């Protein structure tokens, strides 16, 4: 019955408290999600000043319950099925030849707003690497994220690799491990193997003075026939 909460446009709040090689920061984002179209429209603000990492490295951390699942795949939508109680999403992001992110987030309804509250910790980054050295382009490539059921924990797992464009023409790989577990006790939908096709577009607000990122996302599920 959780899917009924996403038939219209839903406001979103995202809050992230981060710590990368000791550099603390906070990010606040607001916008709306349209699950029927698989669309996200958000604006994120660094409320502590300058962001110590490039904005593209936070995109995957900064609400898969807004993915557009086809009609023949509705029975495989774990993320909506756990709502409104929500789910915990935990990740390890390992940047090739550099440090790693450890994240824990809670995604659930607070009132009528879908809220994603995240804690991030970054360890073992190189000072002149592509991340702390701010050598990544302000863009994003389209990707596919593969979903697998975790029936022993009543949740799901996801694994994928993000390709970050580097300003010198090279590519910075970021390997992603993900696990999700429901917060409540109600029944959830445990899916067969499938993937989420995701596209992102990064831009800036010409009137915004704070360090920020304007983000439009399109997420669609695929990989199951019938």
From TrEMBL:
GO terms for biological process: bioluminescence; generation of precursor metabolites and energy. The keyword Zinc-finger does not apply. It holds the Pfam family GFP. The keyword Ribosomal protein does not apply. InterPro entries: GFP, GFP-related, Green_fluorescent_prot. Keywords: Chromophore, Luminescence, Photoprotein. Gene3D superfamilies: Green fluorescent protein. Belongs to the GFP family. This is Green fluorescent protein. It comes from Aequorea victoria.
